[PDB]
Design an enzyme around this catalytic site. Structure first.
Site, mmCIF file in Angstrom:
data_model
loop_
_atom_site.group_PDB
_atom_site.id
_atom_site.type_symbol
_atom_site.label_atom_id
_atom_site.label_comp_id
_atom_site.label_asym_id
_atom_site.label_seq_id
_atom_site.Cartn_x
_atom_site.Cartn_y
_atom_site.Cartn_z
ATOM 1 N N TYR C 156 -8.463 7.989 -2.403
ATOM 2 C CA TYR C 156 -7.821 6.723 -2.006
ATOM 3 C C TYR C 156 -8.363 6.235 -0.655
ATOM 4 C CZ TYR C 156 -4.158 3.240 -0.813
ATOM 5 O OH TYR C 156 -3.474 2.108 -0.514
ATOM 6 N N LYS C 160 -10.534 2.789 -0.008
ATOM 7 C CA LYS C 160 -9.997 1.727 0.824
ATOM 8 C C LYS C 160 -10.885 1.380 2.008
ATOM 9 C CE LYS C 160 -6.582 0.358 -1.649
ATOM 10 N NZ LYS C 160 -6.592 -0.992 -2.264
ATOM 11 N N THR C 191 7.102 -0.979 -2.456
ATOM 12 C CA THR C 191 6.637 -1.225 -3.831
ATOM 13 C C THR C 191 6.566 0.129 -4.544
ATOM 14 O OG1 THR C 191 4.304 -0.713 -3.519
ATOM 15 C CG2 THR C 191 4.975 -3.034 -2.861
HETATM 16 N N1 LIG Z 1 2.480 -0.076 -0.994
HETATM 17 C C1 LIG Z 1 1.964 0.335 0.189
HETATM 18 O O1 LIG Z 1 2.639 0.999 0.971
HETATM 19 C C2 LIG Z 1 0.569 0.086 0.416
HETATM 20 C C3 LIG Z 1 -0.079 0.440 1.601
HETATM 21 C C4 LIG Z 1 -1.424 0.103 1.889
HETATM 22 C C5 LIG Z 1 -2.212 -0.531 0.882
HETATM 23 N N2 LIG Z 1 -1.583 -0.851 -0.347
HETATM 24 C C6 LIG Z 1 -2.395 -1.549 -1.421
HETATM 25 O O2 LIG Z 1 -1.696 -2.732 -1.750
HETATM 26 C C7 LIG Z 1 -2.307 -3.277 -2.905
HETATM 27 C C8 LIG Z 1 -1.090 -3.727 -3.772
HETATM 28 O O3 LIG Z 1 -0.373 -2.542 -4.228
HETATM 29 P P1 LIG Z 1 1.307 -2.476 -4.151
HETATM 30 O O4 LIG Z 1 1.837 -1.757 -2.971
HETATM 31 O O5 LIG Z 1 1.790 -3.880 -4.476
HETATM 32 O O6 LIG Z 1 1.720 -1.431 -5.404
HETATM 33 P P2 LIG Z 1 1.941 -1.785 -6.951
HETATM 34 O O7 LIG Z 1 3.328 -2.390 -6.948
HETATM 35 O O8 LIG Z 1 1.642 -0.595 -7.763
HETATM 36 O O9 LIG Z 1 0.865 -2.839 -7.381
HETATM 37 C C9 LIG Z 1 -0.467 -2.411 -7.779
HETATM 38 C C10 LIG Z 1 -1.002 -3.496 -8.713
HETATM 39 O O10 LIG Z 1 -2.384 -3.256 -9.022
HETATM 40 C C11 LIG Z 1 -2.561 -3.262 -10.447
HETATM 41 N N3 LIG Z 1 -3.597 -2.230 -10.954
HETATM 42 C C12 LIG Z 1 -3.693 -0.904 -10.722
HETATM 43 N N4 LIG Z 1 -4.691 -0.384 -11.429
HETATM 44 C C13 LIG Z 1 -5.214 -1.405 -12.159
HETATM 45 C C14 LIG Z 1 -6.279 -1.508 -12.978
HETATM 46 N N5 LIG Z 1 -6.991 -0.422 -13.272
HETATM 47 N N6 LIG Z 1 -6.593 -2.623 -13.629
HETATM 48 C C15 LIG Z 1 -5.932 -3.928 -13.290
HETATM 49 N N7 LIG Z 1 -4.825 -3.753 -12.316
HETATM 50 C C16 LIG Z 1 -4.553 -2.549 -11.801
HETATM 51 C C17 LIG Z 1 -1.185 -2.891 -10.990
HETATM 52 O O11 LIG Z 1 -1.026 -3.556 -12.230
HETATM 53 P P3 LIG Z 1 -0.957 -2.847 -13.748
HETATM 54 O O12 LIG Z 1 -0.493 -1.445 -13.621
HETATM 55 O O13 LIG Z 1 0.040 -3.728 -14.418
HETATM 56 O O14 LIG Z 1 -2.356 -3.073 -14.115
HETATM 57 C C18 LIG Z 1 -0.245 -3.584 -9.992
HETATM 58 O O15 LIG Z 1 -0.175 -5.023 -10.346
HETATM 59 C C19 LIG Z 1 -3.064 -2.072 -3.617
HETATM 60 O O16 LIG Z 1 -4.481 -2.201 -3.369
HETATM 61 C C20 LIG Z 1 -2.501 -0.857 -2.816
HETATM 62 O O17 LIG Z 1 -3.413 0.210 -2.812
HETATM 63 C C21 LIG Z 1 -0.210 -0.543 -0.570
#
Ligand SMILES: NC(=O)c1ccc[n+]([C@@H]2O[C@H](COP(=O)([O-])OP(=O)(O)OC[C@H]3O[C@@H](n4cnc5c(N)ncnc54)[C@H](OP(=O)(O)O)[C@@H]3O)[C@@H](O)[C@H]2O)c1
Ligand SMILES: NC(=O)c1ccc[n+]([C@@H]2O[C@H](COP(=O)([O-])OP(=O)(O)OC[C@H]3O[C@@H](n4cnc5c(N)ncnc54)[C@H](OP(=O)(O)O)[C@@H]3O)[C@@H](O)[C@H]2O)c1
Ligand SMILES: NC(=O)c1ccc[n+]([C@@H]2O[C@H](COP(=O)([O-])OP(=O)(O)OC[C@H]3O[C@@H](n4cnc5c(N)ncnc54)[C@H](OP(=O)(O)O)[C@@H]3O)[C@@H](O)[C@H]2O)c1
Ligand SMILES: NC(=O)c1ccc[n+]([C@@H]2O[C@H](COP(=O)([O-])OP(=O)(O)OC[C@H]3O[C@@H](n4cnc5c(N)ncnc54)[C@H](OP(=O)(O)O)[C@@H]3O)[C@@H](O)[C@H]2O)c1
Lengths: 248, 248, 254, 254
Positions: C156, C160, C191
Site C-alpha cells: 500500500y 501510494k 470510510t
Molecule cells: N480512508 C482513509 O483513511 C484513507 C487514508 C488515506 C488514503 N485513502 C485513499 O482514499 C481513496 C478513497 O478510499 P476511501 O477511504 O473512500 O475507502 P472506500 O470507501 O473503500 O473507497 C474505495 C473505492 O475505490 C474503489 N475500488 C477499489 N478497488 C477497485 C478496483 N479494483 N476497481 C475499481 N474500483 C476499485 C471501491 O469501489 P468497488 O469496491 O465498488 O470497486 C471504492 O469505491 C483510496 O485511494 C484510499 O486508498 C484513504
C-alpha cells in the site's frame, strides 16, 4: 460568499498578494483588518473594498513591532466582534548579496520582518481565534528555502523556511482547540517582490506552467486555506507555485 | 583516519553531540577548533583530545557573537593553516511555553543562538574554506520543525527549520566553488537537550529503532558529511533520527 | 456552483471519499462520470445525483483495466462534450501483513489497483483534457508512504508514494499545455478503508487512529471531497506538481 | 576495511553505481554477492574482486524474478554464513515517451524491474538479516519523482518514488529488530543510464545534465557507491527511514 461570516486579518496588504487577498476575502463576505507600512496604499485598498460593498479596517505599522500585532487584533475584536482567520503575508526579500558580504544588521532586519512578525502575529491572534472556538492561521512562506536555493538570498530563504517550522509546531500545539495553521508557498508572482519586477522569460521558465502567477491566483489559495473547505487541512505547506518546485 | 588532513571547527562542543564529534573527528585525523560558552567543559574536552594523540584549539564565547565567529576562523587559520570543514552544532531548546505566553525577548534569544549563529558561522567560515578550494559546512537542525511539531516549542522549531533554508541557499550559492553545505537532523539523542534528560520510555518509542541515539552515532553522521565519501552530497537535510520522522 | 461548467471523471465513486466527491462535484455544478466495480452502488449514486437535478453518467469496471479508462473518457466526451478534470481516487489497502509473508500476486494486485490504474487513467484522460485547452488530474495518494510508515502495509505504502512520482513527472510533462497535476493525501477518514473500521478491528483502534491527527478526529469523507473540489476548481489555477496534505495534521503529529 | 565482517548483496552489479559499489564494498572488507542479467559482466567483476584478494559470489538472473531473490539470499547464507546488508540498486529507465503513447506492457515492465524487484528483495533479505540480529537494506531510488519531474519519464518517476514509500513502511515494520531501511537517491551519474550518455543523445545534453547540479558536474559512480557504503556502515547506525540525497544539489538547484 466563500468566507461569509468570517473576520480576517491580512498583513502585507499594501500590494501584490496581500492586496489581492484582502480584496478577495472582502468580496467573499469576510470582514477584513488590513495592515502594511504604507498608509497611502492602505487607503487606496480600503477605498476599493468599500463601494464593492465590503467592510475593511486598517492600521499602518511595522509588522516587526509587538505593539502593532496587539493593536491589530484588538481592532478586529473592537470593530467586528472577534477574529476567525489571519493571513500572515507580510515579508520582503530583505538584504541580498554573497554570504560573506552580508551584515548581521541586514540578517536581523530580514528575520524580523519575515519570521519574528509571524511569532508576534501568532502570539496575539491565537487567543482571539481560540475565543470564537477556531479556526485558522496561514503564513506566506516561499518555495525558496523549502524546495530551492538561489545565490545571494540566504537570509530570505532561512526566514521563509523558519515559517514552516513555526507552522508544524503551532499546528500540533493548537490542533485540539480547533485552530488550523498552514503555510502557503507561492512561486513567482507578478508583484514588485518578483525578480522580474530578459529576467521575465527566465522567471516564467522556472514554472511547469511556463508563466508567472497573477496575485489573485495566490489569494485564491489563501482563500481556500481560510475556508470551511480546508477543515481537515493543518500543518500543511501548500505549494501554489505553478510547478516551480518540481521544474528543473 | 577518515578525516586525515582536514581542519575542522566544531561549535556547541562542550557536551553531547558536539563533544562526541570533536572527539571523533580528532581521533580520525582532523585538527579541530572547538567552541562553547563553558570554558571548563572545553578544557576537559581539549584535554581528552590531547593524549589521544589529537590536536585541538579552543575559544570560549557566545555563538551569537559576530566577533567569536571571526576569531574562531582566524584561530583555525593561525594554529593549523586553514579550514576545510565546520560542524555548526551549537543550539539550545531556548524558551518554551504556550505560544501566547512567550516573550519576544525569548524568541529573539532562541533565534540568535540557533539560527543567527549559523549565518555568522557561514559569513566567516566560507572565505577560509574557499581558500583551500573547498569543501564543507554542516549545520545541526532537528526533525522538529521539519517532519514534526510538538506543543510549547515554536521558537526552537522555527529556528531549526530556518537552518534548512539557509542550507539550500548556501548549497546553490557555493556549489560552483566546491563547498558542500548540508543539514544534519538528529532525532532523540542521550544528552541534556533531550526531553528525557516515564519520559525516557515515551521518547524511545518515538523512534522506529525504539531507543535513543548515543551521541557518538550522531557524530558519525556528521563525520560522513565532512568526509570525502560525501563528495556528491550537498543541499541535503540528512535525517539521523532513528526513524523518528516516519514513526507515528 | 463551485465547479459550474466542469466535466469530471471520479473513480472509486461507490463509497467513501469518491462517493462524496462525485455527489459534491455534481451538486456544485459539474457533469460527473463515475466508476467503481459495484454497478448497483453506482446506480444508486447516479440516481441520487439525477434526482437532485444534477447530471451524472456511470460505467462499472475494474480500475486496473485499460479498456475501462479508455471507455470512461469516451463516455465523458460523448455524453457531455469534453473532459476538464479527473479525480483518480480509486484505491484499496490490498494485501497486508509482514513483508516476508506477502505474495508477489498480492503485491502486483495492490499496485495494479492503486498505481497502474493511475497510469491508465492518465493515458486516456490527458488527450481529452488537452483538447479542451487544459484542466487538471488529481490522484488520491496517502500520508502513509509520504510522511509515515506502519507495519504490514508495504504494498500500500509503495503504491501510494509511487503516485507522487507520477504526479511530479506529469506536472512537468503537461504544464505548458495547461493541465495541472496534483496528488491529494488524506489522513484517517471515516470510510470502510480506515484501519478502525475494518471487519476486524480492536475497539482501541479508533482512538489510536483519531489520536494520530493534530485535530484529534478522523475526517468526514466530505472534508476530503472539498479538498479535491479545491484542486479541480479555478481557485487552484496556479497549483500543480503538489502533494496537498488534507490529513488533519497527521504528518506533523507524533 | 570500512565494512569488515559485513556480508552484502549488491544488485545491478554489472555496471555503473552497482559495479563500483560491489567492488568498493569488497575492497573495504565485505563478502559480496552480486547479481545482474549479464553473466559475463558479473564474472569479470568477481574475477577482479577475487584477484585483488577480496571475496565475491555471483548469480545472474532477472531482478524481477522471485526465485532469483530467494537464491541470492541462499547463496550469501550458504557461501558466507549469513546476510548483514543489501544494496538493492538494480534499475532501468524503462520505456520512455509522452504519457498517452506508452504501453501498459512497458509500464509494468518498468515497475517490475524497479519496484517489484525491491519487494522481492526485501521478502527474502529480511529473514536472513533478522537472523543475524539486524543490519540494513538500501534501495537506489532517484531525485526524479522525489524532487523533480521531467517529460517522458512517468513510469520511471513512479517506480522510483514508490521505493521511498516501501522504505518508510519497512523502516517502521523492521526497526524494533535492528534492521535499518533507507533509500539512496543519486543525482546525474556518469553511467550508461544517464540522459547524456544514451545512444542517442544530443551533444548539448551533457552540459544540460551537469548544469542541473549545484556542484555543476555529474557524479563518478564511485561517489554514489561511497554513499551506499556509508548507509551499510556502522557509521549509519541511527539512520533509518531516510531518503538520502547524494545528488550534487540537484534537488535544490533550479
Ligand atoms: N480512508 C482513509 O483513511 C484513507 C487514508 C488515506 C488514503 N485513502 C485513499 O482514499 C481513496 C478513497 O478510499 P476511501 O477511504 O473512500 O475507502 P472506500 O470507501 O473503500 O473507497 C474505495 C473505492 O475505490 C474503489 N475500488 C477499489 N478497488 C477497485 C478496483 N479494483 N476497481 C475499481 N474500483 C476499485 C471501491 O469501489 P468497488 O469496491 O465498488 O470497486 C471504492 O469505491 C483510496 O485511494 C484510499 O486508498 C484513504
Ligand atoms: N512575489 C513572488 O514571486 C513571491 C514568491 C515567493 C514568496 N513570496 C512572498 O509573498 C508575500 C507577499 O509579497 P508579494 O509577492 O505580494 O510582494 P509585495 O508586492 O512586496 O507585498 C509585500 C507586502 O509586505 C509588506 N512589508 C514589507 N516589510 C514590511 C514591514 N517591515 N512592516 C509591515 N509590512 C511590510 C509590504 O507593505 P509596506 O511596504 O507598505 O509596509 C507589502 O504590503 C511575501 O511574504 C513574499 O516574501 C512572493
Ligand atoms: N539531543 C536531542 O535529542 C536533539 C534532537 C534534535 C536536534 N538536537 C540538536 O543537537 C545539537 C547538539 O545538542 P545536544 O543534543 O548535544 O545538546 P547539548 O548536550 O546541550 O549540547 C548543546 C551545545 O550547544 C551549546 N550552546 C547553547 N547555547 C550557546 C550559546 N549561546 N553560545 C555558545 N554555545 C551554546 C552548548 O555549549 P555551552 O552551554 O557550554 O555554551 C553545548 O555545547 C543542538 O543544535 C540541538 O538543538 C538535539
Ligand atoms: N545514472 C544516473 O544518473 C542515475 C540517477 C538516479 C538514479 N539512478 C539509478 O541508479 C541505479 C544504478 O543504475 P546506473 O546509473 O549504475 O546505470 P547502469 O550502468 O545501467 O546500471 C543498471 C544496472 O541494473 C541492472 N538491471 C537493469 N535491469 C535489470 C533486470 N531486469 N534484471 C537484473 N538487473 C537489471 C543492469 O544490469 P544488466 O543489464 O546486466 O542486467 C545494470 O547492472 C538504478 O536504479 C538507476 O535507475 C541512476
Amino acid at each position: 460568499s466563500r468566507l461569509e461570516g468570517k473576520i480576517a486579518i491580512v498583513t502585507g496588504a499594501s500590494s501584490g498578494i496581500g492586496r489581492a487577498a484582502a480584496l478577495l476575502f472582502a468580496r467573499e463576505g469576510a470582514k477584513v483588518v488590513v495592515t502594511a507600512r504604507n498608509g497611502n496604499a492602505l487607503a487606496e485598498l480600503t477605498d476599493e473594498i468599500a463601494g464593492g460593498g465590503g467592510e475593511a479596517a486598517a492600521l499602518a505599522g511595522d509588522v516587526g513591532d509587538e505593539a502593532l500585532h496587539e493593536a491589530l487584533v484588538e481592532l478586529a475584536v473592537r470593530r467586528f466582534g472577534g477574529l476567525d482567520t489571519a493571513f500572515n503575508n507580510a515579508g520582503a526579500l530583505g538584504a541580498m548579496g554573497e554570504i560573506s558580504s552580508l551584515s548581521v544588521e541586514g540578517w536581523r532586519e530580514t528575520l524580523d520582518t519575515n519570521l519574528t512578525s509571524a511569532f508576534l502575529a501568532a502570539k496575539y491572534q491565537v487567543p482571539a481565534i481560540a475565543a470564537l472556538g477556531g479556526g485558522s492561521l496561514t503564513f506566506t512562506s516561499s518555495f525558496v528555502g523549502h524546495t530551492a536555493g538561489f545565490a545571494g538570498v540566504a537570509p530570505y530563504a532561512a526566514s521563509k523556511a523558519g515559517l514552516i517550522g513555526l507552522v508544524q509546531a503551532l499546528a500540533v500545539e493548537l490542533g485540539a482547540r480547533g485552530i488550523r495553521v498552514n503555510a502557503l508557498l507561492p512561486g513567482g508572482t507578478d508583484t514588485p517582490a518578483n525578480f522580474a519586477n530578459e529576467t521575465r522569460g527566465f522567471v516564467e521558465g522556472l514554472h511547469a506552467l511556463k508563466r508567472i502567477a497573477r496575485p489573485e491566483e495566490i489569494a485564491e489559495a489563501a482563500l481556500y486555506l481560510a475556508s470551511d473547505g480546508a477543515s481537515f487541512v493543518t500543518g500543511a505547506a501548500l505549494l501554489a507555485d505553478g510547478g516551480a518546485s518540481v521544474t528543473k
